Every structure is written in structure tokens, then in C-alpha cells.
């Protein structure tokens, strides 16, 4: 709210053109575990939904914690060819 996250930080720069090369920019607000989720970037298949400081790839139907900023960075540019 006031200072933005490294791991949202590099994607930024993408949601302000339209979303990552397969993700399309988006910003619904998901809610979950009591954890309001900001919905980044959303993808038929998956939703990059990170929180105050974690970044989340949720699936068909499973969660996805990130572990460091390398692999965010991974998650969209290593998602599809």
C-alpha cells in the first residue's frame, strides 16, 4: 500500500503494457484464507495473485508459493513457449 514489492516490482513494468507475454493484465482482487490476494495478472490455466509480500501461481485447483524473486521472474517467462 505504500511501498511496492520486489516480486511484483519487475511485473509492474508489464502490467502497465497489458500483462506478461501469455499473461493478460488484470487486477479483479482475489480473496483467500483470509489473505486478500492482488490479482497481478490472471491466464486461462493459472492466476498470479501475490500478497503484502508473497507472490502466489494458483492452478487448476493448487497453490503455488514462489521462494525468491528469480523464480516470479521464472513463472512468467518460463510458463509457455
Same mark, same amino acid.
Given at each position: $500500500? *505504500?511501498? &511496492?514489492?520486489?516480486? !511484483? +516490482? #519487475? @511485473?509492474?513494468?508489464? !502490467? $502497465? /503494457?497489458?500483462?506478461?507475454? $501469455? =499473461? *493478460?493484465?488484470?487486477?479483479? %482482487?482475489?480473496?483467500?484464507?483470509?489473505?486478500?490476494?492482488?490479482?497481478?495478472? *490472471? =491466464?486461462?490455466? &493459472? !492466476? @498470479?495473485?501475490?500478497? %503484502? /509480500?508473497? #507472490?502466489?501461481?494458483?492452478?487448476?485447483?493448487?497453490?503455488?508459493? #514462489? $521462494?525468491?524473486?528469480? +523464480?516470479?521472474?521464472?513463472?512468467? !517467462?518460463?510458463?509457455? +513457449?
Amino acid at each position: $500500500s *505504500h511501498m &511496492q514489492t520486489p516480486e !511484483t +516490482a #519487475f @511485473i509492474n513494468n508489464v !502490467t $502497465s /503494457n497489458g500483462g506478461y507475454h $501469455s =499473461w *493478460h493484465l488484470v487486477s479483479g %482482487d482475489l480473496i483467500v484464507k483470509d489473505v486478500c490476494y492482488k490479482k497481478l495478472l *490472471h =491466464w486461462s490455466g &493459472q !492466476t @498470479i495473485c501475490y500478497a %503484502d /509480500n508473497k #507472490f502466489y501461481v494458483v492452478k487448476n485447483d493448487v497453490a503455488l508459493p #514462489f $521462494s525468491d524473486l528469480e +523464480a516470479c521472474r521464472a513463472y512468467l !517467462t518460463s510458463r509457455a +513457449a
